[PDB]
């Protein structure tokens, strides 16, 4: 029962090189380099599913901070005021109203200034 390897080994190598499309040089042509590059792309993709949640909250906070200072209050006093006024809107929606409905953001600031005073 002698087994030859040609059909199985080619399909395994072709699966790796399909995932390595777009890569530079030997990373899209050569199996020894492409296999190594597909694994490093998988460690990066796992790590950046965690960093995607940090980088968007960092972006929302900087946009709330900019729009709150257009109404005379800082970020840390605007968040404290919305917590005292029991407003449960999160930073993703607050940064979105700050861009698309600037009047409705002013109404939230006056709600937060009222609870602090």
């Amino acid at each position: 029962a002698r087994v030859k390897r040609g059909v199985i080994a080619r399909a395994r190598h072709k699966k790796i090189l399909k995932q390595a499309k777009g890569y530079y040089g030997a990373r899209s042509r050569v199996y020894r380099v492409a296999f190594q590059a597909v694994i490093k792309a998988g460690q990066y993709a796992y790590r950046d599913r965690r960093q995607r949640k940090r980088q968007f909250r960092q972006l929302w906070i900087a946009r709330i901070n900019a729009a709150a200072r257009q109404n005379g209050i800082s970020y840390s006093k605007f968040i404290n005021g919305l917590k005292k006024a029991s407003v449960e809107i999160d930073r993703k929606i607050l940064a979105d109203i700050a861009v698309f409905d600037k009047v409705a953001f002013t109404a939230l600031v006056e709600k937060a200034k009222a609870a602090l005073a």
Binding site: F56, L59, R63, A66, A67, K92, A95, D96, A98, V99
Partner: protein, 142 residues
């Protein structure tokens, strides 16, 4: 829904003019770096230049505290061996005073192609006059 990003073809940029007479050097430079980057706008995007154009007048009359007028030393190297060169704050003011504000603002900007394009919107002059009247700069008393 995805988060808004500013698109560079539709960015509103405005023109301002700042008088630097008697201002502290570093406290003026942090506000300059905020507005060149665009941190004061709700449409802020970290990979888009959404800032403003700023004219700075009277760069030779900026102020520093302490004994920094004779003790702040500016270093650079020329690339040749033994070529380290220094200059005090007063030697920079007396020779090329627009460089003092430009160096301080460049150190507060991001490093890369985008921060080099943010620096291009800064227009520093040593005197009280500029020739950008066609751009109608608004007086920003910061």
């Amino acid at each position: 829904m995805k988060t808004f990003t500013a698109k560079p073809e539709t960015v509103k940029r405005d023109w301002y003019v700042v008088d630097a007479t008697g201002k502290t050097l570093g406290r003026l430079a942090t506000e300059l770096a905020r507005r060149l980057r665009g941190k004061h706008k709700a449409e802020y995007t970290p990979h888009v230049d959404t800032g403003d154009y700023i004219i700075v007048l009277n760069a030779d009359k900026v102020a520093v505290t302490g004994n920094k007028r004779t003790d702040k030393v500016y270093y650079h190297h020329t690339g040749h061996i033994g070529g380290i060169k220094q200059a005090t704050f007063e030697e920079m003011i007396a020779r090329r005073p627009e460089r003092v504000i430009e160096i301080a603002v460049k150190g507060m900007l991001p490093k890369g192609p985008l921060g080099r394009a943010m620096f291009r919107k800064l227009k520093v002059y040593a005197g009280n006059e500029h020739n950008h009247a066609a751009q109608q700069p608004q007086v920003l008393d910061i």
